Design a protein around this ligand. Structure first.
Ligand code: HEM
Ligand code: HEM
Lengths: 145, 145
């Protein structure tokens, strides 16, 4: 359950999340768009959920994709900012989960974002330690789906 | 058409928005809930759109309303951050608008948030000049609805 999954965010996980977000979150447009095109490249079957975005291979030049990618990064910003207070983290994760549940995005489907995250981290010289901290935050959202 | 309403955000308007946001956005939970509870108090009929939140009379103590309130404030953070690049502001506002159009929230209904914003600004002693600027930012969204 999500209260139990939020409890796996221990002190070192929280610190590694903030330390990597300080670099990733510096360029929300650039890293958000890179996140999404890596998801589409590595997991082409997820493009069906994003029909409204139009031609996803245009990347940055697709205004709808660029708008979605920037907004996605503010949801991550929000989660990072709630790490101090588990009660606020949980109520924000459950609120966020509503629209993903309506779209029938399962926990297994959501978990496909981990591969893209690991790759964007790796491009900024953040290794496995950080990829695993981010997998634990994505697991809090998965528990709400 | 959003680009035309965005043209109204002149250099002084953007400056007032950024300066008031420096204070308002520094307590996203507190000021987010104050906007929402002021909206419900002043325009009781808007509660019709928020049946999922349950008992909105609990204010801050209602986890679903607190979750919604914090997420609302990250949408405004995003808008403030895109003010200097009209192309990004417009693709973010148009993406944001999609779910509100599906909820059948008209431009007039959305415009009811202006009284709440004026009151939260005035509680932090930002007068009519700042309220005016915020009405012009809300107008960019209204142009997308
Ligand atoms: C790091 C993970 C993710 C974050 C932070 C995230 C964030 C968001 C945000 C903030 C929105 C806009 C608000 C809303 O409509 O709910 C959104 C929309 C959406 N998300 Fe997620 N999401 C993530 C992963 C995923 C994944 C893995 C899928 C599906 C395979 C997914 C599918 C969708 C879809 C289909 C939309 C709507 C796109 C549109 O038509 O405009 N999301 N997501
Ligand atoms: C300053 C203005 C506003 C901002 C920045 C804002 C922001 C947001 C955000 C970020 C979401 C979550 C993503 C989504 O589902 O679309 C949302 C949801 C929603 N908004 Fe807005 N919104 C604003 C005003 C309004 C107004 C005036 C109404 C209607 C009277 C409205 C009704 C809704 C509803 C019903 C939801 C879903 C709530 C739920 O989770 O059940 N919004 N809004």
């Amino acid at each position: 359950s999500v209260y139990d999954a939020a409890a796996q965010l221990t002190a070192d996980v929280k610190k590694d999340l903030r330390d990597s977000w300080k670099v990733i979150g510096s360029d929300k447009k650039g890293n958000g768009v890179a996140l999404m095109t890596t998801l589409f490249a590595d997991n082409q079957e997820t493009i069906g959920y994003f029909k409204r975005l139009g031609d996803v291979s245009q990347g940055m030049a697709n205004d709808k994709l660029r708008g979605h990618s920037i907004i996605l990064m503010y949801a991550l910003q929000n989660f990072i900012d709630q790490l101090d207070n588990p009660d606020d983290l949980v109520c924000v994760v459950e609120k966020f989960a509503v629209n993903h549940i309506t779209r029938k995005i399962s926990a297994a489907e959501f978990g496909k974002i981990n591969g893209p995250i690991k790759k964007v981290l790796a491009s900024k010289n953040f290794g496995d330690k950080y990829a695993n901290a981010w997998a634990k935050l994505v697991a809090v959202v998965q528990a709400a789906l």
